[PDB]
PDB file of C-alpha atoms and ligand atoms in Angstrom:
ATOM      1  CA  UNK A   4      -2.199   5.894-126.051  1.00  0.00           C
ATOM      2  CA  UNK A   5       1.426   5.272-127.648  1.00  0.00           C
ATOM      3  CA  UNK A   6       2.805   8.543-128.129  1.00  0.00           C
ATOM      4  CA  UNK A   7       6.398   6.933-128.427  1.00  0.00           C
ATOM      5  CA  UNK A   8       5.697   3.792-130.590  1.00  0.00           C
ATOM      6  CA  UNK A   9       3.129   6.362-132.965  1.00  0.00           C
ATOM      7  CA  UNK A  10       6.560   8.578-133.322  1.00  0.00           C
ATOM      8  CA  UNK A  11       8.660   5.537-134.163  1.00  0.00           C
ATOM      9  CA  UNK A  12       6.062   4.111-136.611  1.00  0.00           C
ATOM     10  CA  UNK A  13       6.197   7.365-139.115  1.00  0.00           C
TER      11      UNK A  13
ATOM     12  CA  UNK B   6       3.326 -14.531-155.129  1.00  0.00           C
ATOM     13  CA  UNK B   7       6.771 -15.285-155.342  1.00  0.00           C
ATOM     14  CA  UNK B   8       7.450 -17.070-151.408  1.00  0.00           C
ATOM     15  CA  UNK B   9      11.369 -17.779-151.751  1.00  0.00           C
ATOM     16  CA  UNK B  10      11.551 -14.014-152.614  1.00  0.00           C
ATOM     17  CA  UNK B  11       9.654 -12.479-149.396  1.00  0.00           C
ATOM     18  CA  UNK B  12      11.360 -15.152-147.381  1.00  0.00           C
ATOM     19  CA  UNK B  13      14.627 -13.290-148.640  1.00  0.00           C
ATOM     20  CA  UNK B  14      13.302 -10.014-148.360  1.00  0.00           C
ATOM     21  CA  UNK B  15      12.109 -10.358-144.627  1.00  0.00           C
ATOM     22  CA  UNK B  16      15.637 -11.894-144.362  1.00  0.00           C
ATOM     23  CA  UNK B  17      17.317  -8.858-145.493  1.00  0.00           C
ATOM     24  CA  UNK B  18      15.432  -6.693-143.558  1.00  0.00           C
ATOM     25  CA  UNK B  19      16.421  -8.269-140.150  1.00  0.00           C
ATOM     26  CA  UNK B  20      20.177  -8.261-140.723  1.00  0.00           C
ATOM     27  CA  UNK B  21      19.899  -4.211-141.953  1.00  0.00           C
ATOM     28  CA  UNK B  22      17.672  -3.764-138.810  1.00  0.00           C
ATOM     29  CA  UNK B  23      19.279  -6.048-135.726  1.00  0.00           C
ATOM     30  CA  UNK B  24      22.360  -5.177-134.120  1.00  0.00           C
ATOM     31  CA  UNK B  25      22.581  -8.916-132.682  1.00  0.00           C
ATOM     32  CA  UNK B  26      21.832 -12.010-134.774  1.00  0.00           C
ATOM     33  CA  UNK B  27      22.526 -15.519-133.977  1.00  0.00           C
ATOM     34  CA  UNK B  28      25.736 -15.703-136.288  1.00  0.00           C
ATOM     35  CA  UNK B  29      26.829 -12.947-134.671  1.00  0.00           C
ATOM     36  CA  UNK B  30      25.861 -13.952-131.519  1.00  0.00           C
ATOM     37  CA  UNK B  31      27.646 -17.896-131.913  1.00  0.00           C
ATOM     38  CA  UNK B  32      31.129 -15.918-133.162  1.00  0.00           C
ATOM     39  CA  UNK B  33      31.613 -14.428-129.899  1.00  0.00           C
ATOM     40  CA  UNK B  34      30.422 -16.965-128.015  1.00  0.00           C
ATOM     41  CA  UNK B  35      32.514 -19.415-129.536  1.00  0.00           C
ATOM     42  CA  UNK B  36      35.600 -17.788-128.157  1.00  0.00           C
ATOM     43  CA  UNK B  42      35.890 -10.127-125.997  1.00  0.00           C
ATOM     44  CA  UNK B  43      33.385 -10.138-123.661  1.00  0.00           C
ATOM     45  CA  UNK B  44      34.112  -9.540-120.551  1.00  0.00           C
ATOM     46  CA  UNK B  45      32.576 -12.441-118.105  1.00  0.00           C
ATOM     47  CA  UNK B  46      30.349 -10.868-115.274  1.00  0.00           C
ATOM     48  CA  UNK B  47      29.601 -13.438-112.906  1.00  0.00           C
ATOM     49  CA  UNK B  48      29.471 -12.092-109.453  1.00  0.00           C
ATOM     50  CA  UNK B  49      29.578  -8.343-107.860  1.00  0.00           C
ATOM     51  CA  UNK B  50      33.061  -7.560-108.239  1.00  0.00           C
ATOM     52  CA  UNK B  51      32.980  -7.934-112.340  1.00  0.00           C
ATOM     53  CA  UNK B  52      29.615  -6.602-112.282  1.00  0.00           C
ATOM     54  CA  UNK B  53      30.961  -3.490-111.370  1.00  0.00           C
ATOM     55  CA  UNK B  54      33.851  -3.510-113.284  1.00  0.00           C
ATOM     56  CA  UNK B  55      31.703  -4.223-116.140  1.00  0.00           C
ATOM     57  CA  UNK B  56      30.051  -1.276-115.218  1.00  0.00           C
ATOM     58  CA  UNK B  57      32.585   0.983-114.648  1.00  0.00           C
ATOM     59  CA  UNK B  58      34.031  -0.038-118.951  1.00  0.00           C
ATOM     60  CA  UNK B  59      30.486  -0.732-120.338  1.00  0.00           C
ATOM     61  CA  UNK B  60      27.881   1.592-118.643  1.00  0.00           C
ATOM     62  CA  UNK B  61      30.291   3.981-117.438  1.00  0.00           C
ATOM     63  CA  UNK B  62      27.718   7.057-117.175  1.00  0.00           C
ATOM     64  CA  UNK B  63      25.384   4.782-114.682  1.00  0.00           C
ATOM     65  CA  UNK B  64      27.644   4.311-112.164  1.00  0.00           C
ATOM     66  CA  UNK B  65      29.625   7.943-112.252  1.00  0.00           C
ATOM     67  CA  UNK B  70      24.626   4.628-107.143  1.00  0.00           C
ATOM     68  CA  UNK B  71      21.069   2.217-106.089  1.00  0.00           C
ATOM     69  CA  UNK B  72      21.380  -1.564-105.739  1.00  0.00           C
ATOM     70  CA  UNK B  73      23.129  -4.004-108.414  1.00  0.00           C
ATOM     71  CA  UNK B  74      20.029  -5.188-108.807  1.00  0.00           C
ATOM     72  CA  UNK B  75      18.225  -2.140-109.598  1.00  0.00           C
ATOM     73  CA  UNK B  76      21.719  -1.430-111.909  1.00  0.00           C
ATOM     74  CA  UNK B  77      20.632  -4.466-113.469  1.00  0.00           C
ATOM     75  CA  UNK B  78      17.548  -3.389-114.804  1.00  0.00           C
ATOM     76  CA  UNK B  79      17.829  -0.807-115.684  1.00  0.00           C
ATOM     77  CA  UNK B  80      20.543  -2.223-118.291  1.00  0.00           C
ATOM     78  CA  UNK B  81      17.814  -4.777-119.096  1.00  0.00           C
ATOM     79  CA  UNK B  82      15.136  -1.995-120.161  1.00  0.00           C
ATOM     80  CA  UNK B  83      17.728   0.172-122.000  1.00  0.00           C
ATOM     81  CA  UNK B  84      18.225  -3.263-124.474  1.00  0.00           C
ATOM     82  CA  UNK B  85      14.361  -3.311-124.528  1.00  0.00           C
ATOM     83  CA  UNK B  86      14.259   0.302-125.536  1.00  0.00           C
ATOM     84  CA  UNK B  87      16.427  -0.034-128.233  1.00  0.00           C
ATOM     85  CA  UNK B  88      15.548  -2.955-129.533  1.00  0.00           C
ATOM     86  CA  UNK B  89      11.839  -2.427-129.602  1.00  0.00           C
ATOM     87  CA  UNK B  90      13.259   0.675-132.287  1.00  0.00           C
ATOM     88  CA  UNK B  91      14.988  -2.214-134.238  1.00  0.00           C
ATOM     89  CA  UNK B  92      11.259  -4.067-134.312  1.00  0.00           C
ATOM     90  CA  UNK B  93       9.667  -0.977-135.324  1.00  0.00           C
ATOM     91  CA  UNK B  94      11.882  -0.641-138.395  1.00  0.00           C
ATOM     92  CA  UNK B  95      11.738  -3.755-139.515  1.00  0.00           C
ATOM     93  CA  UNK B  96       8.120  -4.260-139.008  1.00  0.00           C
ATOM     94  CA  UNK B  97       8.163  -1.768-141.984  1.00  0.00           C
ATOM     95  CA  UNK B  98       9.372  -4.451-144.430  1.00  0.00           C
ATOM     96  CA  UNK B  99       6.748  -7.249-144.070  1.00  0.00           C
ATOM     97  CA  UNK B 100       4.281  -6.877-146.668  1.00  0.00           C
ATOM     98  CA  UNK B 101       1.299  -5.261-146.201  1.00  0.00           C
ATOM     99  CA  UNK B 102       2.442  -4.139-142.603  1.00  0.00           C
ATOM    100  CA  UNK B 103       2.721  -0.060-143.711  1.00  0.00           C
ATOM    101  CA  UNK B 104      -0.387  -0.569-145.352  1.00  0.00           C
ATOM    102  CA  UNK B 105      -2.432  -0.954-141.946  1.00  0.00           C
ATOM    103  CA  UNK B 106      -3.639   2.056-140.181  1.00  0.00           C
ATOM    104  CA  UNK B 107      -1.343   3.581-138.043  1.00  0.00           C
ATOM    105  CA  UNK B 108      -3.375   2.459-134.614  1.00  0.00           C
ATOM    106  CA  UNK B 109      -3.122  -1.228-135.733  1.00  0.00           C
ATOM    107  CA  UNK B 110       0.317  -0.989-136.637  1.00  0.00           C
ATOM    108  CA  UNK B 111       0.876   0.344-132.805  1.00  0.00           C
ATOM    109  CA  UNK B 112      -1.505  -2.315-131.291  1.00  0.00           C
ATOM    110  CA  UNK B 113       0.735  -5.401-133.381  1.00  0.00           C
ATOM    111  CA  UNK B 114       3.821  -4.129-132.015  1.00  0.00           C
ATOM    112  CA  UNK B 115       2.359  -3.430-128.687  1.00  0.00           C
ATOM    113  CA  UNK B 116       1.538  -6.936-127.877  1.00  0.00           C
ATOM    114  CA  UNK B 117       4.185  -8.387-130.214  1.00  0.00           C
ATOM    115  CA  UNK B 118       7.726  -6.841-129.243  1.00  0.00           C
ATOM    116  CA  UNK B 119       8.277  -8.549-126.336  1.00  0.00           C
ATOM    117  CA  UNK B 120       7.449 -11.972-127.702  1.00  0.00           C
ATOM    118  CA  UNK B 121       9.957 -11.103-130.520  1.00  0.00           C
ATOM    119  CA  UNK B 122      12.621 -10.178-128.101  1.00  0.00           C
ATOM    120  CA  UNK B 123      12.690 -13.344-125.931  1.00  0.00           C
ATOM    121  CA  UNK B 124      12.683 -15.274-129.309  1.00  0.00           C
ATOM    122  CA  UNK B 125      15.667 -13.383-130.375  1.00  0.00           C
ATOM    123  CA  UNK B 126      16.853 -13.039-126.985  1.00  0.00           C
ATOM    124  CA  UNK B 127      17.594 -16.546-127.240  1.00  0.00           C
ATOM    125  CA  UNK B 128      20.265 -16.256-130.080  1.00  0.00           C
ATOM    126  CA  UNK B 129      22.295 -14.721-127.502  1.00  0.00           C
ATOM    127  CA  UNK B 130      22.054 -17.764-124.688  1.00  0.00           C
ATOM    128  CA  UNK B 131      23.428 -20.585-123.873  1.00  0.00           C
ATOM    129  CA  UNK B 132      22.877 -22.965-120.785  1.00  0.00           C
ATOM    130  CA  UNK B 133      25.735 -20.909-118.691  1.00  0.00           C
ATOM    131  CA  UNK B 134      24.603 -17.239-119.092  1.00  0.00           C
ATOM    132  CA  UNK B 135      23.680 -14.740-122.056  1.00  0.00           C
ATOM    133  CA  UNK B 136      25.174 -11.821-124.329  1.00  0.00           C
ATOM    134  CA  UNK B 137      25.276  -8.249-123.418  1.00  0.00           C
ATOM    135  CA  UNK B 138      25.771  -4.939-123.872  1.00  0.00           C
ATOM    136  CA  UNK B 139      26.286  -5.388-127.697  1.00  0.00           C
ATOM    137  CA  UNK B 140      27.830  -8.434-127.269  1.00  0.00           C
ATOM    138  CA  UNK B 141      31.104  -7.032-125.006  1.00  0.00           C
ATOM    139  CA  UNK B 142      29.435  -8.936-121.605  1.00  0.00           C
ATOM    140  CA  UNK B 143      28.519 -12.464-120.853  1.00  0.00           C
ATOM    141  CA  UNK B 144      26.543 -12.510-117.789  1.00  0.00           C
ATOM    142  CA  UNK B 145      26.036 -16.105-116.026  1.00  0.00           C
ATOM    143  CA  UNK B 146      23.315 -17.570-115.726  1.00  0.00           C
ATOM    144  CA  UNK B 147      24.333 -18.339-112.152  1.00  0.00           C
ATOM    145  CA  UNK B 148      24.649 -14.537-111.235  1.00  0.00           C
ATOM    146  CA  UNK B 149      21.541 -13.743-112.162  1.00  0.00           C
ATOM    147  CA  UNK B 150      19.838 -16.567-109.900  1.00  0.00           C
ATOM    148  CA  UNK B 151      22.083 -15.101-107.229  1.00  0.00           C
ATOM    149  CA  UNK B 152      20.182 -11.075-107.672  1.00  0.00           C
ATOM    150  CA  UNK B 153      17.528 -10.833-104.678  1.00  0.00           C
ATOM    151  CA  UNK B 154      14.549 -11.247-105.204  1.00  0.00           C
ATOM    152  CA  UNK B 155      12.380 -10.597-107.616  1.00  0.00           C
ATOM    153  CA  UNK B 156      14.802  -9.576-109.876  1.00  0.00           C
ATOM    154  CA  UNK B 157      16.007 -12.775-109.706  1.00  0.00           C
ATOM    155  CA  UNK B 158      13.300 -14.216-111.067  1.00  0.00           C
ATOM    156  CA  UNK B 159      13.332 -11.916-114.618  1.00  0.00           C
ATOM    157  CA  UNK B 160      16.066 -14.295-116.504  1.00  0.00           C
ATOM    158  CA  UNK B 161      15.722 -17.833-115.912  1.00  0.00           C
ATOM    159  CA  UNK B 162      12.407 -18.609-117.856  1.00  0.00           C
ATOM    160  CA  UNK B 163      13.695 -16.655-120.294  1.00  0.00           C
ATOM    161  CA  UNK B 164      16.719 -19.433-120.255  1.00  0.00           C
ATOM    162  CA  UNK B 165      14.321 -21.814-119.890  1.00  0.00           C
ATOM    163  CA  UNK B 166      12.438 -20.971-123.019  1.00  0.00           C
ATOM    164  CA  UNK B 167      15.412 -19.994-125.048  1.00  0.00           C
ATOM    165  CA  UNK B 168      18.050 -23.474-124.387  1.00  0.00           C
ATOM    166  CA  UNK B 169      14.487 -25.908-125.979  1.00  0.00           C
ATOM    167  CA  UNK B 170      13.914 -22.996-128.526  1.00  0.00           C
ATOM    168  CA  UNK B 171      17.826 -23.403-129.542  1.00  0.00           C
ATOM    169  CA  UNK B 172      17.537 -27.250-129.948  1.00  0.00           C
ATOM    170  CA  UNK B 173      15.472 -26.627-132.836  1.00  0.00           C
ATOM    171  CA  UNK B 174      18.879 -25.483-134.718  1.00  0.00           C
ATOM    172  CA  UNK B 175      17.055 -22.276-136.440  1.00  0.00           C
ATOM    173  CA  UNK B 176      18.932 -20.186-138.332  1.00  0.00           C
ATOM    174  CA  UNK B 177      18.704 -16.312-138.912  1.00  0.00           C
ATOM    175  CA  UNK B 178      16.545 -17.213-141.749  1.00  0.00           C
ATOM    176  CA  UNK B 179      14.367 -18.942-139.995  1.00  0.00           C
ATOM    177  CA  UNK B 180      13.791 -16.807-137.680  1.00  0.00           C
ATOM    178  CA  UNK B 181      13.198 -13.232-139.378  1.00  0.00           C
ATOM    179  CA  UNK B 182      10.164 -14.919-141.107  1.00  0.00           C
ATOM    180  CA  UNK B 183       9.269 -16.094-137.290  1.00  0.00           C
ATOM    181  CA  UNK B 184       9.604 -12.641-135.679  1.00  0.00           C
ATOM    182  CA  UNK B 185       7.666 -11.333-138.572  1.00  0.00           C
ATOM    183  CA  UNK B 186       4.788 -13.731-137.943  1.00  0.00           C
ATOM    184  CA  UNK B 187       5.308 -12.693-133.998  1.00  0.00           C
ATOM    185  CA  UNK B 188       4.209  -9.121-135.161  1.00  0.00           C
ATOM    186  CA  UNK B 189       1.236 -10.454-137.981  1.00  0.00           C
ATOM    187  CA  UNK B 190      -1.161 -12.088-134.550  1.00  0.00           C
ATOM    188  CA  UNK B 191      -4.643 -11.265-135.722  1.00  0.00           C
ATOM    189  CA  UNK B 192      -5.914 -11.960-132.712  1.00  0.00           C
ATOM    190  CA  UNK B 193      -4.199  -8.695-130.498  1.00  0.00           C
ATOM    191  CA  UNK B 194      -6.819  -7.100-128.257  1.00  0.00           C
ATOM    192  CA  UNK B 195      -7.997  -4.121-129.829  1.00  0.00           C
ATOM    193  CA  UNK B 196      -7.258  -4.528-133.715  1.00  0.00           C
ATOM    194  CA  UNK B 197      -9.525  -2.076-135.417  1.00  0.00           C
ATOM    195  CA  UNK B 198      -9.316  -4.307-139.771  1.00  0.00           C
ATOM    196  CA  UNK B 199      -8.784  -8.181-138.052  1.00  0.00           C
ATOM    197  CA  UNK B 200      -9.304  -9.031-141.981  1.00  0.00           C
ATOM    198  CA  UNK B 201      -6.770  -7.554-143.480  1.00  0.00           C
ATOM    199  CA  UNK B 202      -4.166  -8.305-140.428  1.00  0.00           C
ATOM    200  CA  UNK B 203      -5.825 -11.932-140.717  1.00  0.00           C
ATOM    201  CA  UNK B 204      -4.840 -12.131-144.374  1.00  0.00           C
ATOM    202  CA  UNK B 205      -1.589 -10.546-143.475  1.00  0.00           C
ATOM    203  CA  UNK B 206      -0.669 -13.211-141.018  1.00  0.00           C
ATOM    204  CA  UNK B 207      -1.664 -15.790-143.744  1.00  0.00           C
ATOM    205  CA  UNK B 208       0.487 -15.278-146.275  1.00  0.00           C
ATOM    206  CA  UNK B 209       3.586 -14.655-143.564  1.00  0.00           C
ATOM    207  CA  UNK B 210       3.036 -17.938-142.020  1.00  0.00           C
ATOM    208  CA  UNK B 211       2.549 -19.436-145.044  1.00  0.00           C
ATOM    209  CA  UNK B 212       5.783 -17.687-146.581  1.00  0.00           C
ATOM    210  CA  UNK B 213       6.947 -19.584-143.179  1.00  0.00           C
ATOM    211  CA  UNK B 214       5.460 -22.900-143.342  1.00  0.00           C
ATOM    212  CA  UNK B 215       7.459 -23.144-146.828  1.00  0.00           C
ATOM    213  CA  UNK B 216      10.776 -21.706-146.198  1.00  0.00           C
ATOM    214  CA  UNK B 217      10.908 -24.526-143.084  1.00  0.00           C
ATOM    215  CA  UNK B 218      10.360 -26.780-145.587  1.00  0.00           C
ATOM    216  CA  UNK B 219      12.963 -26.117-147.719  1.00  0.00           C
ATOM    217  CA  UNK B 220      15.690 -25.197-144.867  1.00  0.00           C
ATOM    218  CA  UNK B 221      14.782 -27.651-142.394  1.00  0.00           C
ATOM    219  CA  UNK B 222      13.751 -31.045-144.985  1.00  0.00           C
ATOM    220  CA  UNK B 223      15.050 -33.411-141.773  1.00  0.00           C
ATOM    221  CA  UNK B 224      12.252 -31.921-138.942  1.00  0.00           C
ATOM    222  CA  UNK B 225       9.121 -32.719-140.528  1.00  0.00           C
ATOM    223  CA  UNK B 226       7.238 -31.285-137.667  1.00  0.00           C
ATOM    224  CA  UNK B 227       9.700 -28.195-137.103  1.00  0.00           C
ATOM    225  CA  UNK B 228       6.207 -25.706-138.606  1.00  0.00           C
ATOM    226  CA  UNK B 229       3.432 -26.781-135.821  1.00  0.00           C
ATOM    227  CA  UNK B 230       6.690 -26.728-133.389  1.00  0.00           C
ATOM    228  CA  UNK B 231       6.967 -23.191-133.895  1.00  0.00           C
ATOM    229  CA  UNK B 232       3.279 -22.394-133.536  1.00  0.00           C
ATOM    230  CA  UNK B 233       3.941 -24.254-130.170  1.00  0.00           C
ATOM    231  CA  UNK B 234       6.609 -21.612-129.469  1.00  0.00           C
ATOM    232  CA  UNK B 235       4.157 -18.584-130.768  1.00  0.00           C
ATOM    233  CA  UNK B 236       1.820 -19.789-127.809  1.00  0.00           C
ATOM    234  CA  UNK B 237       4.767 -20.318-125.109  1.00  0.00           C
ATOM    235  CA  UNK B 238       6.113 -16.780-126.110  1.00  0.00           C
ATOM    236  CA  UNK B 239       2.577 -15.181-125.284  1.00  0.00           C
ATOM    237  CA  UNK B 240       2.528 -16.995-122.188  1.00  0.00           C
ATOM    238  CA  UNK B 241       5.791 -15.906-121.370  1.00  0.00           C
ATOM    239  CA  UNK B 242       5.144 -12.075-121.983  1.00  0.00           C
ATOM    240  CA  UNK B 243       1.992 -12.568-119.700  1.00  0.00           C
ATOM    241  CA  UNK B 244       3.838 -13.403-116.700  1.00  0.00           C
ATOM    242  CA  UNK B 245       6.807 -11.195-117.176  1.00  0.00           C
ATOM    243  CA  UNK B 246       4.219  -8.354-117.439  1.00  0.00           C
ATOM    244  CA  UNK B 247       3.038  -9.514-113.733  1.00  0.00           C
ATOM    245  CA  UNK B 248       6.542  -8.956-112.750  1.00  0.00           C
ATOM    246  CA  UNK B 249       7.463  -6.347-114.373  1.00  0.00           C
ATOM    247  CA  UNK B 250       4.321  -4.937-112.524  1.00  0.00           C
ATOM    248  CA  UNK B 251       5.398  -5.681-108.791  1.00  0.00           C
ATOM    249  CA  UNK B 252       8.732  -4.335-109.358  1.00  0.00           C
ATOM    250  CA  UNK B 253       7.270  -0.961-110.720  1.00  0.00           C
ATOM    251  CA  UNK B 254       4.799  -1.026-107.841  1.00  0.00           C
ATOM    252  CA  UNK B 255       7.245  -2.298-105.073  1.00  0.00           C
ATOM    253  CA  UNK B 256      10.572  -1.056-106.093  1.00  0.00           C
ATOM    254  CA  UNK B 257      10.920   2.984-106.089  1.00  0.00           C
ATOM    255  CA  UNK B 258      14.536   2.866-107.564  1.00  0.00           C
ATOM    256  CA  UNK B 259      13.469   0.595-110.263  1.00  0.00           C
ATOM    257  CA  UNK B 260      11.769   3.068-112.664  1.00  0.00           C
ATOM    258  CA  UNK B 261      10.280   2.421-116.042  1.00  0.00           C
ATOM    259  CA  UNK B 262      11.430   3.744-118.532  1.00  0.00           C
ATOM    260  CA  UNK B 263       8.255   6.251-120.730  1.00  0.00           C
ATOM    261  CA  UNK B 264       8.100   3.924-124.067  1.00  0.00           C
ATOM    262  CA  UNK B 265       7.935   0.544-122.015  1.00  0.00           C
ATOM    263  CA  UNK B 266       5.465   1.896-119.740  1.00  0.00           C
ATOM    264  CA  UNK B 267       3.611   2.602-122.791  1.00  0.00           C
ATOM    265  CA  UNK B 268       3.848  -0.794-124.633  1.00  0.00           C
ATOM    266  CA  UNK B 269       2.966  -2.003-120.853  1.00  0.00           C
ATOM    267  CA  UNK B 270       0.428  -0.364-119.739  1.00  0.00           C
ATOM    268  CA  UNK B 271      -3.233  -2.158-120.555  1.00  0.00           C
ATOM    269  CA  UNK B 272      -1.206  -4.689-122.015  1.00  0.00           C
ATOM    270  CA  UNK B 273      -2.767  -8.129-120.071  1.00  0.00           C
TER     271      UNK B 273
HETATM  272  C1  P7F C 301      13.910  -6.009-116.663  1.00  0.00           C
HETATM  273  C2  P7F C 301      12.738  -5.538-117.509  1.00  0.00           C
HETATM  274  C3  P7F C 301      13.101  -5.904-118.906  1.00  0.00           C
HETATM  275  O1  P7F C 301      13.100  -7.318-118.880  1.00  0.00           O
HETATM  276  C4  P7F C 301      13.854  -8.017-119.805  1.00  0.00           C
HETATM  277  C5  P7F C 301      13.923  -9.508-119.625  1.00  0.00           C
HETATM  278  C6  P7F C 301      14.754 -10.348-120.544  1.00  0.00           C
HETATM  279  C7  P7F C 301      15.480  -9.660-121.657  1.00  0.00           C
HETATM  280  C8  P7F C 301      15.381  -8.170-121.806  1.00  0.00           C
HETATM  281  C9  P7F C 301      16.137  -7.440-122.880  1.00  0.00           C
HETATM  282  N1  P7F C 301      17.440  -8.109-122.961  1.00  0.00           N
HETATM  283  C10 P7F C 301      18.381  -8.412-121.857  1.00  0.00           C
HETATM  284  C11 P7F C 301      19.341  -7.253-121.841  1.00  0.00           C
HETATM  285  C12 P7F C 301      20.268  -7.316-120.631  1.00  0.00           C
HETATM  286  O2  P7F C 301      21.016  -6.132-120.805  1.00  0.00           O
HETATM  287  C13 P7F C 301      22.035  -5.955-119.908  1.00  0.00           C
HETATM  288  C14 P7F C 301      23.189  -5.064-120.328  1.00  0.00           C
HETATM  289  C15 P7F C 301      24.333  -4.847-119.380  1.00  0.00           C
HETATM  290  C16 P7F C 301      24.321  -5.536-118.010  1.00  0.00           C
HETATM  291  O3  P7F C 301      25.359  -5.397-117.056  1.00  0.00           O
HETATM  292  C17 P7F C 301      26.472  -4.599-117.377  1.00  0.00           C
HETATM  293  C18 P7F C 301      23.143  -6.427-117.634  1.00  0.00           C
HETATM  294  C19 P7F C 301      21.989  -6.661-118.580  1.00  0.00           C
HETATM  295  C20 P7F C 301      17.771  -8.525-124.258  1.00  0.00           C
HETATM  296  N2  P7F C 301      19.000  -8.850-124.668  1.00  0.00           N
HETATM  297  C21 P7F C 301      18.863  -9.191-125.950  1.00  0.00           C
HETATM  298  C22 P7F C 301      19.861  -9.680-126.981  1.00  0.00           C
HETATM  299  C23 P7F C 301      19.361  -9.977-128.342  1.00  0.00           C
HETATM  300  C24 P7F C 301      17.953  -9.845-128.720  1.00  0.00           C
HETATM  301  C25 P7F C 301      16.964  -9.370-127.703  1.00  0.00           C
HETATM  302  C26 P7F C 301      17.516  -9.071-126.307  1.00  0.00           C
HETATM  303  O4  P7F C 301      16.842  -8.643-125.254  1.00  0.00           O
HETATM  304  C27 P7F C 301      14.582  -7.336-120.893  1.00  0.00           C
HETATM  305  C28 P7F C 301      11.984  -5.453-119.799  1.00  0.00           C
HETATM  306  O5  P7F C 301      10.846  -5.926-119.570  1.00  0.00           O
HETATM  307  O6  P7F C 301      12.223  -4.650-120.719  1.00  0.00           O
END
């Protein structure tokens, strides 16, 4: 649902 | 548990992570930017600052588009730093999404306000000051983003918070056990608990003249969600009403089924 924030979180 | 030390550690982490803190901010604004208060040194501000944007829709639309960029970018710098508060990268993944989600905007009106004063704000990396009066002037709505934001940030700024202060507030922003949605509310719960309480005693120590300066800030916590709630209904018209005013993919995310 947060493609973008998932990305930035790994 | 040794508090002064994770107060210092948080601390740490938000000066690596933050392009703009309030010392920062206060050098500058204690006198370069380049003052943008009406449409002529708008778009001269423009033409040094933005240059690619206007190589054209309404100022307004100009406008905020500039405003979401700084969201973009500084919901990156909340990502990273989120990293550093303890038992944060221990959460799964889909809670760590769900505290920023709700959080990042809360923490960037707090830290927005480091770069205010009553006449107009900090931008574009601190090379602009826009007035206050300017933005009142836009048409509406997008008149009506800024001034609670000034609102909020010149009784937030009477407290007299210092960077300090407030990387242990931004990182109890992000530790809310109560988000919609969080999948271990225990663990965020007991998160949250020893943040606020790493908090609770660093105020103590910094701030030994403003015995009440802790339950203020809780105060603020609950203004700041309010805040985010109606600038999402704003936001929200101006996607819906506003064709030139796009959003941009990551804060349509953090929007979208937000409140
Ligand atoms: C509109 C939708 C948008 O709302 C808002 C509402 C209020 C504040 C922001 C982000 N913001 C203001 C940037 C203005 O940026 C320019 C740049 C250039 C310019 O003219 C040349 C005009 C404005 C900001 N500043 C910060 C400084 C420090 C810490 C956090 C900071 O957050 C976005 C959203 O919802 O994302």
């Amino acid at each position: 649902r947060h493609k973008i924030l998932h990305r930035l979180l790994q | 548990a040794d508090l002064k030390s994770l107060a210092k550690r948080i601390y740490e982490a938000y000066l690596k992570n933050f392009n703009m803190n309030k010392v920062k901010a206060r050098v500058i604004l204690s006198g370069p930017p380049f003052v943008i208060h009406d449409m002529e040194t708008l778009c001269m501000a423009e033409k040094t600052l933005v240059a690619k944007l206007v190589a054209n829709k309404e100022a307004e639309v100009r406008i905020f588009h500039c405003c979401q960029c700084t969201s973009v970018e500084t919901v990156t710098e909340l990502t990273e730093f989120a990293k550093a508060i303890p038992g944060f990268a221990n959460l799964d993944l889909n809670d760590q999404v769900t505290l920023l989600k709700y959080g990042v905007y809360e923490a960037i009106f707090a830290m927005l306000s480091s770069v205010m004063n009553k006449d107009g704000m900090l931008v574009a990396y601190g090379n602009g000051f826009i007035t206050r009066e300017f933005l009142k002037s836009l048409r509406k709505p997008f008149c009506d983003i800024m001034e609670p934001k000034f609102d909020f940030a010149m009784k937030f700024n009477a407290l007299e918070l210092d960077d300090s202060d407030i990387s242990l507030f931004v990182a109890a922003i992000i530790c809310c056990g109560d988000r919609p949605g969080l999948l271990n509310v225990g663990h965020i719960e007991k998160m949250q608990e020893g943040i606020v309480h790493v908090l609770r005693l660093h105020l103590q120590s910094n701030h030994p003249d403003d015995i009440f300066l802790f339950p203020k800030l809780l105060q603020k916590m609950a203004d700041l969600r309010q805040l985010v709630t109606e600038h999402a209904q704003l936001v929200q018209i101006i996607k819906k009403t506003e064709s030139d005013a796009a959003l941009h993919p990551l804060l349509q995310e953090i929007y979208r089924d937000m409140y």
